[PDB]
Amino acid sequence: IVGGTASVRGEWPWQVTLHTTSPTQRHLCGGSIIGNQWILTAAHCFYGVESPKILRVYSGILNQAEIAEDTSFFGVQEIIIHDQYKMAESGYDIALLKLETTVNYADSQRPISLPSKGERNVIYTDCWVTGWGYRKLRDKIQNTLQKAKIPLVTNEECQKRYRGHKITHKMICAGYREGGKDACKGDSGGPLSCKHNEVWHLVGITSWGEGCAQRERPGVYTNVVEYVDWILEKTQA
Ligand SMILES: O=C(/C=C/c1cc(Cl)ccc1-n1cnnn1)N[C@@H](Cc1ccccc1)C(=O)Nc1ccc(-c2nnn[nH]2)cc1
């Protein structure tokens, strides 16, 4: 997260850190708890991942330093990637992880609500991006979970900033014209969370951008409301 600040324990309890163990254990991507056995994340996180056995999901984490060999984690039973997905920049950048065991909800770990199709006209004014990603294009994975409040921009605006791409209706963009606050490397798969009528909604999944926090280059996110039917179908199995 560029231009953000350290979060406090318990303020983003749907946020998880997904680790891979191959070739060695490290943070791979963010994710969001959406059900007792279900993490929603980005499809692009699973490049080269041939088995769910190498994945570990850690919940209730503020600092990566909390994760040692003796720290509890959730195993992954199955990775479900959208069948139209090919790469992040062309969309369908969404995936589900079915956990091996169930998350017992607490103030440290609880699900975020999905957006409603009836809310497509809602102007979300209180949106936050979170994660352990770089704080500059060249930086490193953060110990402490970061947060930044970032304004949504219209898809029409976003398209003008990425004329070499197609910004689709299943994408949503966020950023300042002058830059300075954005997701960055290591934040992908995590949530863009918007508070509306005193409830947090999972509006976006951190997906891609050209550089981090650059002038006239908003961050691009998977537009979650455009996938609620897909999420339902896949979780009903
Ligand atoms: O995490 C991201 C974020 C990309 C991104 C998203 C938005 Cl909304 C706006 C700008 C973005 N960036 C553009 N250039 N950098 N960020 N991307 C992942 C892509 C990816 C994930 C998994 C597998 C392959 C590729 C990444 O680089 N992740 C990442 C994770 C860890 C490290 C890392 N560094 N040191 N140790 N681990 C570096 C990069």
Tab-separated table of N, CA and C in Angstrom, residues 38-163:
chain	number	residue	atom	x	y	z
A	38	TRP	N	-14.410	-20.251	3.140
A	38	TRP	CA	-14.221	-19.603	1.837
A	38	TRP	C	-13.435	-18.298	1.892
A	39	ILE	N	-12.344	-18.258	1.123
A	39	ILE	CA	-11.572	-17.042	0.894
A	39	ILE	C	-11.781	-16.608	-0.564
A	40	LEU	N	-12.041	-15.319	-0.764
A	40	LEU	CA	-12.099	-14.719	-2.097
A	40	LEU	C	-10.808	-13.958	-2.354
A	41	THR	N	-10.184	-14.220	-3.503
A	41	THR	CA	-8.898	-13.621	-3.840
A	41	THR	C	-8.778	-13.428	-5.373
A	42	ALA	N	-7.576	-13.117	-5.859
A	42	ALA	CA	-7.357	-12.905	-7.287
A	42	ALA	C	-6.876	-14.196	-7.938
A	43	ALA	N	-7.386	-14.477	-9.137
A	43	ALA	CA	-6.963	-15.637	-9.939
A	43	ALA	C	-5.471	-15.623	-10.279
A	44	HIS	N	-4.911	-14.432	-10.454
A	44	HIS	CA	-3.528	-14.314	-10.928
A	44	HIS	C	-2.522	-14.761	-9.878
A	45	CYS	N	-2.969	-14.874	-8.632
A	45	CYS	CA	-2.087	-15.292	-7.549
A	45	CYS	C	-1.583	-16.713	-7.702
A	46	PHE	N	-2.244	-17.498	-8.542
A	46	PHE	CA	-1.968	-18.916	-8.597
A	46	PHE	C	-1.144	-19.328	-9.798
A	47	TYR	N	-0.412	-18.381	-10.384
A	47	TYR	CA	0.518	-18.735	-11.444
A	47	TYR	C	1.501	-19.786	-10.919
A	48	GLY	N	1.645	-20.883	-11.654
A	48	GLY	CA	2.610	-21.920	-11.304
A	48	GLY	C	2.235	-22.816	-10.136
A	49	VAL	N	1.112	-22.527	-9.475
A	49	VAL	CA	0.634	-23.334	-8.353
A	49	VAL	C	-0.108	-24.534	-8.929
A	50	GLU	N	0.467	-25.723	-8.751
A	50	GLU	CA	-0.055	-26.960	-9.343
A	50	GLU	C	-0.899	-27.762	-8.351
A	51	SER	N	-0.782	-27.434	-7.068
A	51	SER	CA	-1.513	-28.142	-6.022
A	51	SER	C	-1.878	-27.186	-4.886
A	52	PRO	N	-3.067	-27.365	-4.278
A	52	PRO	CA	-3.411	-26.540	-3.124
A	52	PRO	C	-2.623	-26.901	-1.859
A	53	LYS	N	-1.928	-28.039	-1.866
A	53	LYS	CA	-1.168	-28.490	-0.700
A	53	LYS	C	-0.063	-27.526	-0.249
A	54	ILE	N	0.461	-26.721	-1.175
A	54	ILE	CA	1.537	-25.769	-0.859
A	54	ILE	C	1.047	-24.439	-0.273
A	55	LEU	N	-0.270	-24.276	-0.146
A	55	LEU	CA	-0.857	-23.017	0.331
A	55	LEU	C	-1.206	-23.037	1.819
A	56	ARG	N	-1.036	-21.887	2.463
A	56	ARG	CA	-1.423	-21.687	3.846
A	56	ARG	C	-2.125	-20.347	3.972
A	57	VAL	N	-3.294	-20.349	4.606
A	57	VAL	CA	-4.031	-19.117	4.852
A	57	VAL	C	-3.951	-18.753	6.320
A	58	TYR	N	-3.470	-17.550	6.609
A	58	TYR	CA	-3.413	-17.070	7.981
A	58	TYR	C	-4.422	-15.954	8.193
A	59	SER	N	-5.274	-16.131	9.193
A	59	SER	CA	-6.239	-15.117	9.581
A	59	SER	C	-5.885	-14.537	10.952
A	60	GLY	N	-6.515	-13.416	11.277
A	60	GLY	CA	-6.291	-12.735	12.544
A	60	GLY	C	-4.870	-12.229	12.715
A	61	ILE	N	-4.239	-11.836	11.607
A	61	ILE	CA	-2.856	-11.353	11.592
A	61	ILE	C	-2.803	-9.846	11.368
A	62	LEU	N	-2.020	-9.144	12.190
A	62	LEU	CA	-1.660	-7.760	11.902
A	62	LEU	C	-0.252	-7.728	11.320
A	63	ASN	N	0.680	-8.356	12.037
A	63	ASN	CA	2.091	-8.361	11.667
A	63	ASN	C	2.545	-9.704	11.126
A	64	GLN	N	3.241	-9.684	9.998
A	64	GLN	CA	3.782	-10.911	9.430
A	64	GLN	C	4.716	-11.608	10.429
A	65	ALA	N	5.310	-10.835	11.342
A	65	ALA	CA	6.194	-11.390	12.381
A	65	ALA	C	5.479	-12.360	13.338
A	66	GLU	N	4.147	-12.320	13.346
A	66	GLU	CA	3.341	-13.250	14.128
A	66	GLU	C	3.363	-14.661	13.569
A	67	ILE	N	3.789	-14.810	12.316
A	67	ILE	CA	3.754	-16.089	11.625
A	67	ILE	C	5.103	-16.780	11.741
A	68	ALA	N	5.143	-17.797	12.591
A	68	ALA	CA	6.319	-18.623	12.758
A	68	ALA	C	5.910	-20.065	12.527
A	69	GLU	N	6.850	-20.981	12.722
A	69	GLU	CA	6.600	-22.399	12.474
A	69	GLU	C	5.483	-22.927	13.377
A	70	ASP	N	5.335	-22.331	14.558
A	70	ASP	CA	4.331	-22.786	15.521
A	70	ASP	C	3.006	-22.019	15.451
A	71	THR	N	2.826	-21.202	14.410
A	71	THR	CA	1.600	-20.428	14.227
A	71	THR	C	0.537	-21.252	13.492
A	72	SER	N	-0.695	-21.191	13.993
A	72	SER	CA	-1.824	-21.888	13.372
A	72	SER	C	-2.169	-21.287	12.012
A	73	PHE	N	-2.522	-22.151	11.064
A	73	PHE	CA	-2.987	-21.720	9.746
A	73	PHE	C	-4.134	-22.609	9.272
A	74	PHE	N	-4.759	-22.209	8.167
A	74	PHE	CA	-5.766	-23.014	7.484
A	74	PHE	C	-5.184	-23.565	6.197
A	75	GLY	N	-5.328	-24.868	5.994
A	75	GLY	CA	-4.971	-25.476	4.727
A	75	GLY	C	-6.014	-25.197	3.663
A	76	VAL	N	-5.631	-25.406	2.410
A	76	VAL	CA	-6.525	-25.197	1.280
A	76	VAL	C	-6.862	-26.552	0.649
A	77	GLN	N	-8.162	-26.826	0.545
A	77	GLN	CA	-8.669	-28.046	-0.069
A	77	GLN	C	-8.739	-27.905	-1.590
A	78	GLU	N	-9.195	-26.743	-2.056
A	78	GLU	CA	-9.415	-26.524	-3.481
A	78	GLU	C	-9.231	-25.065	-3.889
A	79	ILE	N	-8.666	-24.878	-5.079
A	79	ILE	CA	-8.532	-23.571	-5.715
A	79	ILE	C	-9.522	-23.529	-6.870
A	80	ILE	N	-10.417	-22.545	-6.868
A	80	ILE	CA	-11.396	-22.405	-7.946
A	80	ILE	C	-11.148	-21.093	-8.666
A	81	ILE	N	-10.709	-21.183	-9.917
A	81	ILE	CA	-10.373	-20.018	-10.717
A	81	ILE	C	-11.461	-19.851	-11.775
A	82	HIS	N	-11.871	-18.607	-12.021
A	82	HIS	CA	-12.897	-18.323	-13.022
A	82	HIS	C	-12.464	-18.885	-14.382
A	83	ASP	N	-13.348	-19.610	-15.063
A	83	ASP	CA	-12.927	-20.335	-16.279
A	83	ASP	C	-12.665	-19.452	-17.510
A	84	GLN	N	-13.056	-18.182	-17.442
A	84	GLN	CA	-12.752	-17.204	-18.485
A	84	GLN	C	-11.478	-16.409	-18.184
A	85	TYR	N	-10.888	-16.625	-17.008
A	85	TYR	CA	-9.645	-15.939	-16.645
A	85	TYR	C	-8.456	-16.380	-17.503
A	86	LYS	N	-7.674	-15.404	-17.950
A	86	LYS	CA	-6.428	-15.673	-18.663
A	86	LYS	C	-5.260	-14.881	-18.073
A	87	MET	N	-5.466	-13.585	-17.846
A	87	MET	CA	-4.504	-12.793	-17.086
A	87	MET	C	-5.185	-11.588	-16.455
A	88	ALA	N	-4.567	-11.094	-15.388
A	88	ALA	CA	-5.163	-10.024	-14.590
A	88	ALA	C	-5.656	-8.834	-15.411
A	89	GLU	N	-4.838	-8.360	-16.351
A	89	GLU	CA	-5.146	-7.133	-17.088
A	89	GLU	C	-6.312	-7.258	-18.074
A	90	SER	N	-6.752	-8.479	-18.363
A	90	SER	CA	-7.937	-8.683	-19.200
A	90	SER	C	-9.176	-9.118	-18.394
A	91	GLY	N	-9.056	-9.175	-17.073
A	91	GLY	CA	-10.224	-9.369	-16.210
A	91	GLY	C	-10.541	-10.802	-15.830
A	92	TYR	N	-11.756	-11.014	-15.328
A	92	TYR	CA	-12.154	-12.269	-14.701
A	92	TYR	C	-11.138	-12.677	-13.631
A	93	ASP	N	-10.515	-11.676	-13.010
A	93	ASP	CA	-9.439	-11.927	-12.062
A	93	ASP	C	-10.025	-12.196	-10.685
A	94	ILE	N	-10.522	-13.411	-10.502
A	94	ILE	CA	-11.218	-13.787	-9.289
A	94	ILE	C	-11.061	-15.284	-9.065
A	95	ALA	N	-10.886	-15.650	-7.806
A	95	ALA	CA	-10.722	-17.039	-7.412
A	95	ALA	C	-11.233	-17.260	-5.991
A	96	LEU	N	-11.652	-18.492	-5.726
A	96	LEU	CA	-12.056	-18.927	-4.397
A	96	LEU	C	-11.095	-19.980	-3.876
A	97	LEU	N	-10.803	-19.902	-2.583
A	97	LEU	CA	-10.124	-20.965	-1.863
A	97	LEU	C	-11.092	-21.597	-0.885
A	98	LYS	N	-11.291	-22.900	-1.054
A	98	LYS	CA	-12.025	-23.706	-0.107
A	98	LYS	C	-11.047	-24.232	0.925
A	99	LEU	N	-11.268	-23.853	2.174
A	99	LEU	CA	-10.385	-24.222	3.266
A	99	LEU	C	-10.622	-25.672	3.715
A	100	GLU	N	-9.579	-26.288	4.263
A	100	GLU	CA	-9.644	-27.662	4.787
A	100	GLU	C	-10.414	-27.745	6.095
A	101	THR	N	-10.346	-26.681	6.889
A	101	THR	CA	-11.111	-26.583	8.127
A	101	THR	C	-11.864	-25.265	8.126
A	102	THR	N	-12.768	-25.106	9.087
A	102	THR	CA	-13.643	-23.947	9.125
A	102	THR	C	-13.102	-22.870	10.055
A	103	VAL	N	-13.302	-21.619	9.658
A	103	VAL	CA	-12.905	-20.480	10.468
A	103	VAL	C	-13.959	-20.249	11.535
A	104	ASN	N	-13.537	-20.268	12.792
A	104	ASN	CA	-14.421	-19.922	13.888
A	104	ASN	C	-14.397	-18.416	14.063
A	105	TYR	N	-15.517	-17.772	13.763
A	105	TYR	CA	-15.546	-16.322	13.702
A	105	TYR	C	-15.291	-15.664	15.051
A	106	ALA	N	-14.565	-14.550	15.011
A	106	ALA	CA	-14.240	-13.757	16.191
A	106	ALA	C	-14.001	-12.308	15.768
A	107	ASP	N	-13.759	-11.419	16.727
A	107	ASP	CA	-13.431	-10.032	16.393
A	107	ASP	C	-12.142	-9.936	15.564
A	108	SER	N	-11.314	-10.974	15.625
A	108	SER	CA	-10.079	-11.055	14.842
A	108	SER	C	-10.255	-11.637	13.440
A	109	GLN	N	-11.363	-12.334	13.190
A	109	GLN	CA	-11.542	-13.052	11.923
A	109	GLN	C	-13.015	-13.288	11.649
A	110	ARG	N	-13.564	-12.533	10.705
A	110	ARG	CA	-14.982	-12.618	10.409
A	110	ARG	C	-15.212	-12.232	8.955
A	111	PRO	N	-16.336	-12.675	8.374
A	111	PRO	CA	-16.554	-12.497	6.939
A	111	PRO	C	-17.007	-11.098	6.572
A	112	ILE	N	-16.604	-10.635	5.390
A	112	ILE	CA	-17.111	-9.370	4.865
A	112	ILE	C	-18.286	-9.666	3.946
A	113	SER	N	-19.304	-8.819	4.017
A	113	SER	CA	-20.491	-8.978	3.189
A	113	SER	C	-20.194	-8.679	1.736
A	114	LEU	N	-20.815	-9.446	0.846
A	114	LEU	CA	-20.724	-9.172	-0.585
A	114	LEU	C	-21.682	-8.039	-0.952
A	115	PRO	N	-21.349	-7.267	-1.997
A	115	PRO	CA	-22.235	-6.192	-2.430
A	115	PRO	C	-23.492	-6.750	-3.072
A	116	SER	N	-24.562	-5.965	-3.038
A	116	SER	CA	-25.830	-6.370	-3.614
A	116	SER	C	-25.965	-5.793	-5.023
A	117	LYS	N	-26.585	-6.561	-5.913
A	117	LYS	CA	-26.868	-6.102	-7.276
A	117	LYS	C	-27.705	-4.827	-7.279
A	118	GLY	N	-28.554	-4.669	-6.269
A	118	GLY	CA	-29.343	-3.448	-6.107
A	118	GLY	C	-28.524	-2.211	-5.771
A	119	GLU	N	-27.248	-2.397	-5.436
A	119	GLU	CA	-26.368	-1.293	-5.054
A	119	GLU	C	-25.475	-0.805	-6.198
A	120	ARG	N	-25.794	-1.174	-7.436
A	120	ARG	CA	-24.979	-0.761	-8.585
A	120	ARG	C	-24.963	0.755	-8.816
A	121	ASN	N	-25.970	1.459	-8.299
A	121	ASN	CA	-26.035	2.921	-8.393
A	121	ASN	C	-25.513	3.651	-7.164
A	122	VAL	N	-25.185	2.905	-6.110
A	122	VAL	CA	-24.618	3.494	-4.901
A	122	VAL	C	-23.296	4.162	-5.253
A	123	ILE	N	-23.122	5.389	-4.771
A	123	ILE	CA	-21.852	6.089	-4.865
A	123	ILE	C	-21.111	5.785	-3.573
A	124	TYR	N	-20.140	4.877	-3.642
A	124	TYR	CA	-19.347	4.532	-2.467
A	124	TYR	C	-18.338	5.646	-2.226
A	125	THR	N	-18.380	6.243	-1.038
A	125	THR	CA	-17.530	7.388	-0.709
A	125	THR	C	-16.487	7.088	0.370
A	126	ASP	N	-16.530	5.883	0.941
A	126	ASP	CA	-15.679	5.519	2.076
A	126	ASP	C	-15.014	4.162	1.830
A	127	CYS	N	-14.103	4.143	0.860
A	127	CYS	CA	-13.450	2.914	0.407
A	127	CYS	C	-11.980	2.866	0.795
A	128	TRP	N	-11.547	1.691	1.245
A	128	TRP	CA	-10.208	1.490	1.784
A	128	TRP	C	-9.545	0.281	1.138
A	129	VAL	N	-8.278	0.426	0.773
A	129	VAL	CA	-7.490	-0.706	0.289
A	129	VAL	C	-6.467	-1.073	1.356
A	130	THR	N	-6.286	-2.372	1.569
A	130	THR	CA	-5.432	-2.863	2.650
A	130	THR	C	-4.508	-3.970	2.200
A	131	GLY	N	-3.359	-4.085	2.856
A	131	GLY	CA	-2.465	-5.201	2.583
A	131	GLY	C	-1.055	-5.013	3.094
A	132	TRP	N	-0.234	-6.031	2.866
A	132	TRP	CA	1.162	-6.060	3.292
A	132	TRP	C	2.118	-5.769	2.124
A	133	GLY	N	1.592	-5.198	1.051
A	133	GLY	CA	2.396	-4.893	-0.125
A	133	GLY	C	3.404	-3.779	0.039
A	134	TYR	N	4.197	-3.601	-1.005
A	134	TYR	CA	5.202	-2.545	-1.056
A	134	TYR	C	4.585	-1.164	-0.814
A	135	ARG	N	5.368	-0.259	-0.229
A	135	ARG	CA	4.935	1.121	-0.006
A	135	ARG	C	5.463	2.058	-1.096
A	136	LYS	N	6.246	1.504	-2.023
A	136	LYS	CA	6.738	2.198	-3.222
A	136	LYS	C	6.941	1.100	-4.276
A	137	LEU	N	7.010	1.437	-5.567
A	137	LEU	CA	7.223	0.427	-6.612
A	137	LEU	C	8.410	-0.475	-6.263
A	138	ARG	N	9.495	0.135	-5.799
A	138	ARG	CA	10.638	-0.623	-5.311
A	138	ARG	C	10.672	-0.498	-3.803
A	139	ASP	N	10.361	-1.597	-3.129
A	139	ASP	CA	10.255	-1.610	-1.676
A	139	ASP	C	10.250	-3.075	-1.263
A	140	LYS	N	9.574	-3.422	-0.179
A	140	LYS	CA	9.488	-4.817	0.199
A	140	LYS	C	8.163	-5.085	0.882
A	141	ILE	N	7.905	-6.358	1.134
A	141	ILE	CA	6.709	-6.762	1.857
A	141	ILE	C	6.778	-6.170	3.266
A	142	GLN	N	5.657	-5.617	3.712
A	142	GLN	CA	5.563	-4.959	5.009
A	142	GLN	C	5.305	-5.962	6.118
A	143	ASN	N	5.822	-5.663	7.304
A	143	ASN	CA	5.461	-6.423	8.488
A	143	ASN	C	4.004	-6.149	8.883
A	144	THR	N	3.662	-4.872	9.036
A	144	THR	CA	2.374	-4.464	9.573
A	144	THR	C	1.393	-4.153	8.447
A	145	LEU	N	0.204	-4.734	8.544
A	145	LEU	CA	-0.878	-4.477	7.586
A	145	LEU	C	-1.136	-2.989	7.411
A	146	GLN	N	-1.125	-2.528	6.161
A	146	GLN	CA	-1.323	-1.109	5.844
A	146	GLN	C	-2.725	-0.835	5.321
A	147	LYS	N	-3.151	0.416	5.441
A	147	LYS	CA	-4.450	0.848	4.931
A	147	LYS	C	-4.333	2.210	4.253
A	148	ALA	N	-5.167	2.428	3.243
A	148	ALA	CA	-5.287	3.735	2.590
A	148	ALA	C	-6.717	3.945	2.123
A	149	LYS	N	-7.238	5.152	2.350
A	149	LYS	CA	-8.550	5.538	1.845
A	149	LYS	C	-8.357	6.084	0.437
A	150	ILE	N	-9.023	5.479	-0.541
A	150	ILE	CA	-8.808	5.850	-1.938
A	150	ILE	C	-10.157	6.070	-2.608
A	151	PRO	N	-10.283	7.159	-3.388
A	151	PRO	CA	-11.550	7.432	-4.053
A	151	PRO	C	-11.735	6.594	-5.302
A	152	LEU	N	-12.959	6.120	-5.514
A	152	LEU	CA	-13.291	5.438	-6.753
A	152	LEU	C	-13.305	6.455	-7.894
A	153	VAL	N	-12.916	6.002	-9.079
A	153	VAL	CA	-13.034	6.812	-10.291
A	153	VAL	C	-13.946	6.065	-11.251
A	154	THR	N	-14.617	6.801	-12.127
A	154	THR	CA	-15.544	6.190	-13.065
A	154	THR	C	-14.770	5.320	-14.035
A	155	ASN	N	-15.432	4.317	-14.590
A	155	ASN	CA	-14.797	3.501	-15.621
A	155	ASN	C	-14.438	4.310	-16.865
A	156	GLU	N	-15.229	5.343	-17.154
A	156	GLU	CA	-14.951	6.239	-18.279
A	156	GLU	C	-13.616	6.954	-18.045
A	157	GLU	N	-13.416	7.450	-16.827
A	157	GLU	CA	-12.162	8.109	-16.450
A	157	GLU	C	-11.002	7.117	-16.531
A	158	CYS	N	-11.189	5.964	-15.912
A	158	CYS	CA	-10.159	4.935	-15.890
A	158	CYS	C	-9.708	4.513	-17.290
A	159	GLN	N	-10.664	4.355	-18.206
A	159	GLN	CA	-10.346	3.970	-19.583
A	159	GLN	C	-9.435	4.994	-20.259
A	160	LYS	N	-9.665	6.275	-19.987
A	160	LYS	CA	-8.822	7.334	-20.553
A	160	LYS	C	-7.382	7.245	-20.050
A	161	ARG	N	-7.191	6.663	-18.864
A	161	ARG	CA	-5.859	6.496	-18.282
A	161	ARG	C	-5.143	5.232	-18.751
A	162	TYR	N	-5.892	4.281	-19.305
A	162	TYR	CA	-5.337	3.024	-19.799
A	162	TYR	C	-5.796	2.745	-21.229
A	163	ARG	N	-5.397	3.604	-22.163
A	163	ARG	CA	-5.885	3.490	-23.542
A	163	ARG	C	-5.315	2.293	-24.306
